[PDB]
């Protein structure tokens, strides 16, 4: 949900060690970059996503 | 039917392995196996207290 | 998580560190000496007096 000026916080999942795409939101496209680090975990009990 | 329950297994994770202590009461399987196409499975039969990676 | 530092040998003063993991929020650790002592094995032989 859109507000007029607010600022909307969207959860990703993503493999990449710098990741960067564009963000389709519902006309226009921004860019998202940014650098993601390891996990804490070995072995989980969800598969991936 | 009341069936026993044994004690759980102590699990020690490490990148891409899963280690198991398991100090059985009386005798109990402990079958493995992969969700993959090839499974691998491990039918086996452990009476003693046994570490498994 | 396994974090070595290392601390001076020295009683009163606090010693502050913290730990940064790296995509996570840093966690502060604090060890403050008071009473550091040195206790020899002690074996008696003998006493005397007058």
Same mark, same amino acid.
């Not at chain 3, 530092?5 to 650790?29: D, E, F, K």
């Given at each position: 949900?859109?507000?007029?000026?607010?600022?909307?916080?969207?959860?990703?999942?993503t493999?990449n060690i710098?990741p960067?795409?564009?963000?389709?939101?519902?006309?226009?496209?921004?860019?998202?970059?940014?650098d993601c680090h390891?996990?804490?975990?070995?072995?989980?009990?969800?598969?991936?996503? | 039917?009341?069936?026993?329950?044994?004690?759980?297994?102590?699990?020690?994770?490490?990148?891409? #392995?899963? #280690?198991?202590?398991?100090?059985?009461?009386?005798?109990?399987?402990?079958?493995?196996?992969?969700?993959?196409?090839?499974?691998?499975?491990?039918?086996?039969?452990? #009476?003693?207290?046994?570490?498994?990676? | 998580?396994?974090?070595?530092?290392?601390?001076?040998?020295?009683?009163?003063?606090?010693?502050?560190?913290?730990?940064?993991?790296?995509?996570?929020?840093?966690?502060?650790?604090?060890?403050?000496?008071?009473?550091?002592?040195?206790?020899?094995?002690?074996?008696?032989?003998?006493?005397?007096?007058?």
């Amino acid at each position: 949900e859109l507000t007029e000026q607010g600022s909307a916080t969207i959860h990703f999942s993503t493999a990449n060690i710098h990741p960067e795409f564009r963000l389709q939101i519902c006309t226009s496209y921004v860019t998202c970059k940014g650098d993601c680090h390891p996990p804490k975990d070995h072995i989980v009990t969800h598969p991936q996503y | 039917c009341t069936v026993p329950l044994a004690p759980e297994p102590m699990i020690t994770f490490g990148f891409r #392995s899963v #280690s198991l202590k398991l100090h059985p009461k009386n005798p109990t399987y402990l079958i493995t196996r992969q969700l993959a196409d090839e499974p691998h499975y491990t039918h086996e039969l452990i #009476s003693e207290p046994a570490v498994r990676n | 998580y396994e974090h070595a530092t290392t601390m001076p040998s020295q009683a009163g003063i606090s010693y502050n560190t913290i730990v940064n993991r790296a995509g996570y929020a840093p966690l502060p650790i604090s060890i403050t000496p008071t009473k550091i002592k040195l206790i020899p094995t002690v074996n008696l032989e003998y006493v005397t007096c007058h």
